[PDB]
Design a binder for this molecule. Structure first.
Ligand code: HEM
Ligand SMILES: O=C1O[C@H]([C@@H](O)CO)C(O)=C1O
Ligand code: NA
Length: 250
């Protein structure tokens, strides 16, 4: 009941469905689901509840936001999706990029995340610096996800499981390597790899390791490593919330 979703026209809803189908095909065909999940996450994760600035309002299309250090490489994602966007002028970029994130999770075998249309494309990007620093720990994660975004500790741990997709690139973040052996499969392997410690061929960031040492995050890591269904449920809820920060709030 925290949300009151806006009414959109039947044509808007039809465009959502047709764009979803084109996104599902392209993301699968081009093997770019991890980059697209990151696109949606960096689009949404800048929301700060105290000023109601940032969040999933299409501003990743803005070159000034693409230029933020944390967004290196997301220009590729924007460009890859633009041919589809051109076919759906009625859709906001805000909705389109969140839809791409939902589809990325779907096509890699993850949960089906509800999608509600109607986000506006806002003119101003957030200030740079809202997104989490991979070198920091649990206090920082709580400031970013909790105090800025308004998400719970459960959401932090579940959403960290997005690292089951993809990898770090030395020219983008400067880190290098994948968290899992199957970076195109959405599963609970991220948590299993965390629990087993570091191993040759896989990467863990300090922000990932903070989940193991924190007394509230660690039981969630244990739960998700043992129970993929519980992970998918909590991930679905967290991703839904993330994708709607600042949007349709009652
Ligand atoms: C918890 C705090 C987080 C930190 C510190 C963090 C940090 C990073 C870093 C440094 C990269 C590498 C970027 C590159 O070099 O290409 C990355 C990639 C990625 N992140 Fe996170 N991230 C966090 C949370 C999230 C969340 C919440 C999601 C989505 C639910 C997510 C999804 C991804 C994905 C899918 C990639 C791989 C992208 C690719 O393979 O192109 N991350 N993250
Ligand atoms: O997930 C990704 O997709 C592309 C490439 O791997 C396939 O298009 C890209 O650069 C990634 O980070
Ligand atoms: Na994986």
């Amino acid at each position: 009941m925290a949300k009151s979703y806006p009414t959109v026209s039947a044509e808007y809803s039809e465009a959502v469905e047709k764009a979803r189908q084109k996104l599902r095909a392209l993301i699968a065909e081009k093997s770019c689901a991890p980059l697209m999940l990151r696109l949606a996450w960096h689009s949404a994760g800048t929301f700060d509840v105290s000023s109601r600035t940032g969040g999933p309002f299409g501003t990743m299309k803005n070159p000034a936001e693409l230029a933020h250090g944390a967004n290196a490489g997301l220009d590729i994602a924007v460009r890859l999706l633009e041919p589809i966007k051109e076919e759906f002028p009625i859709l906001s970029y805000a909705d389109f990029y969140q839809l791409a994130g939902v589809v990325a999770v779907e096509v890699t075998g993850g949960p089906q995340i509800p999608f509600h249309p109607g986000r506006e494309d806002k003119p101003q990007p957030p200030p740079e610096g809202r997104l989490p620093d991979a070198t920091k720990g649990s206090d920082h994660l709580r400031q970013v996800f909790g105090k800025q975004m308004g998400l719970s500790d459960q959401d932090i741990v579940a959403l960290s499981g997005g690292h089951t997709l993809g990898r770090c690139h030395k020219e983008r973040s400067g880190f290098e390597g994948a968290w899992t052996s199957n970076p195109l499969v959405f599963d609970n392997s991220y948590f299993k790899e965390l629990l087993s410690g570091d191993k040759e061929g896989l990467l863990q960031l300090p922000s990932d390791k903070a989940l193991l040492s924190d007394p509230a995050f660690r039981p969630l890591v244990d739960k998700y490593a043992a129970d993929e269904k519980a992970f998918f449920e909590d991930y679905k809820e967290a991703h839904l919330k993330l994708s709607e920060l600042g949007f349709a709030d009652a």
